[PDB]
Amino acid sequence: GTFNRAMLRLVPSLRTYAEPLTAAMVEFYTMSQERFTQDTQPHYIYSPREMTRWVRGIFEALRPLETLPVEGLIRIWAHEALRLFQDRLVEDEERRWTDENIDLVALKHFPNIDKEKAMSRPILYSNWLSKDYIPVDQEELRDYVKARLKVFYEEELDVPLVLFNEVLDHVLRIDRIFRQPQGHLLLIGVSGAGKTTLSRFVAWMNGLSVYQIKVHRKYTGEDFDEDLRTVLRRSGCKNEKIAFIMDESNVLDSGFLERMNTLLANGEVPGLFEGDEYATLMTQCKEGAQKEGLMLDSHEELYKWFTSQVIRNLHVVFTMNPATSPALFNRCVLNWFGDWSTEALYQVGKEFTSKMDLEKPNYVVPDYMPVVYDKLPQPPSHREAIVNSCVFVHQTLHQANARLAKRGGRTMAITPRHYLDFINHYANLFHEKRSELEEQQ
Amino acid sequence: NQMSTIAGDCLLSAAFIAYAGYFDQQMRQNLFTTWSHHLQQANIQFRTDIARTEYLSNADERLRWQASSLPADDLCTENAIMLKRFNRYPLIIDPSGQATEFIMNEYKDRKITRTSFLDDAFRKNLESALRFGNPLLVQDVESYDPVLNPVLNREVRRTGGRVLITLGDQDIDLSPSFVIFLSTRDPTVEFPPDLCSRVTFVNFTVTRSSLQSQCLNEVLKAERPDVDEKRSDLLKLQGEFQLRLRQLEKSLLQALNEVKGRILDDDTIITTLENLKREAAEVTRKVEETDIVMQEVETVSQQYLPLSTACSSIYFTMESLKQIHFLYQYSLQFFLDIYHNVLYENPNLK
């Protein structure tokens, strides 16, 4: 309540809503903490840090805006609630429960409010298409991110990417993290989902400089300390935005993680810069403060400014698969990469099989067609049937692995990388056989 | 018609390559039958009898494989096809080592280097393979070193004019001619889903069904040579006969190019045409009688099926005998020697 009063001090129109909003926040937080516990999923940890992140998100969304209606404040409240609570959830019923209760808590504490105006099914926020972090519709976001993916094909990696709904949602989540104060992300999910790809794509898209640790045979803690020195020197002194991406190839060493937690929490690593290193850090911090326009002279104030710059400049992106301390879970904003849904598989198939012919004008739609994509157009075309069959093949591998596990045999995981491999193989084989027959003809 | 059929054929073949490979022979066949049933249910045209080995390979490559140490089995031919048309670096799970020797023989001209994960000099060799562009076969993958994750995932960063890959603490210049074959000799091994995503599995393990099929094929080859020849003709009719027919067509066109006076010097050139026609008729006959020969070979195979099941059961009892006592170590080659003794040099059969 004190924090919300300080936050809503900017917009006087929402001051009388400081007391109710806080209550709503608290209630929802409590509800989630009762509903989701670490016994189900190890990352279902809730603490006052999530509430501080909620307040910080609402503060960052409200700071540049001159005025808001009450519906806008409730909408950003719901947006931050979704980004902090629903994102970590693994199963679908949990996400549905969270989405329903957000509305209940909002209305319960905010009566006489236009629910439609304050609550649309695709609650969406981004300042990519404007100057301020305003709500934005789904279609223009999809168009803008498709254009930026087309750009990202030339610069950096050349392998194609498909922008389906889950990918775009995760892109928006990672962008929100990259625009938060000390916003650190933990992409937890299945292998091959696209965690590294999307993290790097959003980091490039927002201009962040991707830095990754290169551990080796007997990696020394002194080497990790030097890497941290370089990263914080660039983030704080040089005013450079850095996406500090870490993967399980080096996250598995918890000795570095427990030292990373200090930077994740406070935004500084005391004892990292000492002696000569501390003197050079103070010199460069003085130079940077003068360049920005601050004549801070005392070493303590310079260190405070450096810590603030690291808070506002350095973002750490952890990438892991479903050991890790709950403190690390609670320091980072949790995002879940599930296995690609049927719609995602269908979209990937249609995009990656678009250069193929896959068009029979005399194709006959079979009565009671076996359909795996519910939203598949009826009546389907030949290409639609082919992509449906591809999705069915992936689903049959999943069912086969489930049956083998039930019988007691050893099974391997079918990641979305298997589906991408299958579609690439289909393209190569189709083109090869067509070329062979055409030259024969 | 083959234009009409290629879409379904390639869908099934690509699914087989990408998805099958860890499963046993019956499980691959069940997956293929499920996919074929779905494609038929949706009116997606495909050939009813997809011979995967002959669709995804030609006689020249199969003969070259047989020149190498690739056993002439359906499972091994399918596994070699996966080892050929792979987009992800394969993980070989042979318990015997024939597949590793096959890989070494295939890439001997490319200077393939055999390394192990247990070797302390592994990483260094890997760096060389990444930098100088040489095939590398890394064994003992059950102790997989996660440092290979960027290499298997092909995560490259194109800084400057040099393409890099992060191996350990060092950024190695990836070479276009690099290929790595992971391998293991442990059939009962579990891999993390990360590695499962970065590699394609190629299982050479001999199971009950694989050995049953081997024994059935050997019975057919030994005691019913005519039925074995007819079955081989079915497999060859999936393109090999047409391949040689079109090769003779090309030869006839080449001979018909040189036509100036010598076309009617004897006016008996028609012989070559007759030859093609004859073979055409032959293959046409083999096309027309395909269903009858399929029924015949299936009945003859059902005749010797119980013997094949008996052979599989006998071998697996022999293999399991090691639990009774440590001396009871009997290899598959030992059972095959027993079985060839029973088949060929059996004085009772005289």
Binding site: R407 | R208, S313, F316, T317, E319, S320, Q323
Partner: peptide, 29 residues
């Protein structure tokens, strides 16, 4: 098991259920 792999699960389930039935649940100190 290793001699013939395919029945074993149901038999083991029944055997373990019977064993749980015979073996007393708790022993008092």
């Amino acid at each position: 098991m290793l001699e013939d792999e395919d029945a074993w699960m149901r038999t083991l389930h029944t055997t373990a259920s019977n064993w749980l039935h015979l073996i007393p649940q708790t022993l008092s100190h």
